[PDB]
Amino acid sequence: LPVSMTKTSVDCTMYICGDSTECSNLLLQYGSFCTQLKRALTGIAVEQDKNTQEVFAQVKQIYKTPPIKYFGGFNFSQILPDPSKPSKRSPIEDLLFNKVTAQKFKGLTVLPPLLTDEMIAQYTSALLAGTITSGWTFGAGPALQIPFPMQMAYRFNGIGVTQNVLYENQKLIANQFNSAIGKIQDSLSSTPSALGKLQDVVNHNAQALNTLVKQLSSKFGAISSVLNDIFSRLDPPEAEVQIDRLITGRLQSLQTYVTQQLIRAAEIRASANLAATKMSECVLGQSKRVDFCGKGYHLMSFPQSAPHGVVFLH
Amino acid sequence: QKLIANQFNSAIGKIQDSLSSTPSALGKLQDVVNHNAQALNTLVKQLSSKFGAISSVLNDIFSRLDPPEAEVQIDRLITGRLQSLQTYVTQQLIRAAEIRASANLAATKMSECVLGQSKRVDFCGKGYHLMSFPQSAPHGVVFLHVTYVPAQEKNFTTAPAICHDGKAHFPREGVFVSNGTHWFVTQRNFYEPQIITTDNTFVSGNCDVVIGIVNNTVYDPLQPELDS
Amino acid sequence: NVFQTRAGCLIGAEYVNNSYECDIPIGAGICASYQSIIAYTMSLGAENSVAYSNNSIAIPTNFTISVTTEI
Amino acid sequence: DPLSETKCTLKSFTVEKGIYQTSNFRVQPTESIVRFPN
Ligand SMILES: *[C@@H]1O[C@H](CO)[C@@H](O[C@@H]2O[C@H](CO)[C@@H](O)[C@H](O)[C@H]2NC(C)=O)[C@H](O)[C@H]1NC(C)=O
Ligand SMILES: *[C@@H]1O[C@H](CO)[C@@H](O[C@@H]2O[C@H](CO)[C@@H](O)[C@H](O)[C@H]2NC(C)=O)[C@H](O)[C@H]1NC(C)=O
Ligand SMILES: *[C@@H]1O[C@H](CO)[C@@H](O[C@@H]2O[C@H](CO)[C@@H](O)[C@H](O)[C@H]2NC(C)=O)[C@H](O)[C@H]1NC(C)=O
Ligand SMILES: *[C@@H]1O[C@H](CO)[C@@H](O[C@@H]2O[C@H](CO)[C@@H](O)[C@H](O)[C@H]2NC(C)=O)[C@H](O)[C@H]1NC(C)=O
Ligand SMILES: *[C@@H]1O[C@H](CO)[C@@H](O)[C@H](O)[C@H]1NC(C)=O
């Protein structure tokens, strides 16, 4: 599930005009579109930060997993943080980062996100520790520790299967779960199209920005696309008309870009709300809604971070 | 009952006080208004832009110049104003779509948390949901969620099942605990210890397959009755 | 009183090794607050540790009725 | 002053707590040069 897109900002005068000075003087009579554009872009940026904080920051405590990682035959090494790596990330998170991938500042900028990747990884690790050592009670009050097999017995009792079924087939279920985790790791490694959504978001944003910067080199019916050439060539009364046409065309392009950005931000915000709902319901508890948290009868789920998104293992 | 009622009254009084104190609590509604007016304000400001023409005064353009280029100036003014109005309409449409989504979410909350009890976690308040109340507000609705939260936890030693006469007893609805000397069965969310019997536990197989089983006796209520 | 962050350059605020809740977000994990003006790294929350073991449980013995608001 | 520029940008005499975008800076050229063929 994607969560947030790239926080962008645009410099009006350096894009609409060039290195010349009198072009800004000509602009000063055209209105205050720069204010509207800046307001819209800051709104989008703060919405992106709000989306990320809403999706991830849902616990007021930072739990730590116990040093001894024994849970009655269950193996969580593939999802828990690995201290060996300097970045303190799970192997699945590293694979996700490696599976997902110029610098022409012509007034176009990219604002950094408020929450660094390390902080998001810390949130995910805290969520994993809480959901492992305390079941679901940590999502509705103080965390209470429960042995993991007892938690699995509770979860089976949730879907309508008695506890003795688990308590008699503990080792087989543990083996199945470990094999499933390994198979998920391998399948995600060997599938190129599995991560289509986040790559699609990145490609859309980069392609839109590239289209914007490429459109600057269009004549728009003028004699030339270089304003400095126009000013040094014609009588200013008619060079004024030429520059007026150029400015109107470029402003129309910028308006189109802003509108597309607004629509994409709205869609991404809807997706982020869906992701927040899934995190609240499927992770911090057990859900009886069909197909909301995976195919089949639901038992639990685990979160993982990803570039501009989250990945749920149901 | 009496303690719960006192806690409820104190909680609702605290809610009234907190609402009366914090000024930012109603930001979400206020922002809506704080958006609309200012956007409208911007539109009015756009009426005072020359849009690259010689003057921003239309009748001045008529009076001071002959029709040939006055037509061009008026066309420029009309195009600029029409474009500004179009932009305002589009922005209003986007805001309307967002508001409609929020209204649908509010309708779902009213249908589920108010007219019934919902088991969705964190959907109708933090903690175990009990019930809720609606209240009106300028261009909005305020929900008061009444919820239940445990506190004053205590440590205990637990076991999955009990082995007795080569049979395995599992709790029917509760969980086994022990203060250190004796074993009891209690409900999950509240410490209410009870004597373990054969009516609140069920038997399945022998006690040689489960892991962590412990040894203890299980009282039978019908034995004293048959004794007499 | 000159600081270098990932976002850019900050003039007029001093970096502090302490940590608090974010008040005025700057970016890249850096926030600012007034107490003069200071800048720091935001703290995610209060650290906690659970006493997990193989056969121990925790059971509540009291409850609390809470009321929350949602606008 | 930067505070004065913020006040002018918001078109008010009082600005609430937060971070505001005022303008942009660009270093101006120092001198001029010219190069033409022999
Ligand atoms: C839990 O799973 C991990 C990996 O799924 C196991 O780590 C493997 O351990 C064996 C023997 O120590 C090594 O030969 C493998 O190379 C390890 N896997 C990897 C990916 O490095 C681990 O043994 C399992 N059990 C526990 C208790 O952690
Ligand atoms: C564990 O609980 C049992 C059940 O209450 C306790 O046994 C009784 O404790 C009371 C309290 O002093 C005594 O008056 C009774 O005489 C005890 N029962 C018997 C049969 O002797 C037991 O003491 C508790 N254990 C601990 C360590 O608190
Ligand atoms: C629970 O009680 C059973 C029955 O008394 C114990 O099983 C005996 O264990 C001893 C010691 O290992 C053996 O010599 C006997 O042959 C066992 N008898 C049977 C019928 O199994 C069991 O060890 C007890 N468990 C605990 C934890 O005390
Ligand atoms: C459960 O908690 C409630 C409140 O958290 C306790 O009620 C308090 O009891 C003390 C002593 O009796 C009084 O001084 C307080 O005024 C009570 N609080 C309220 C809000 O009325 C209650 O005693 C606790 N239950 C147990 C068994 O300890
Ligand atoms: C007790 O806990 C330790 C570590 O938590 C574990 O290694 C051991 O197997 C547990 N004992 C039993 C009987 O489960």
Side-chain angles (χ1 to χ4, degrees), chain D residues 12-31:
Chain D
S12 170
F13 277 12
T14 59
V15 288
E16 271 305 357
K17 179 187 66 166
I19 174 171
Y20 304 87
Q21 210 288 337
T22 62
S23 191
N24 49 359
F25 67 93
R26 44 174 66 87
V27 59
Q28 302 282 5
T30 72
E31 73 261 9

Side-chain angles (χ1 to χ4, degrees), chain A residues 130 134-146 284, chain B residues 128 150 189:
Chain A
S134 70
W136 61 73
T137 73
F138 85 102
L144 314 177
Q145 70 264 24
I146 288 173
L284 272 71
Chain B
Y128 298 119
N189 294 299

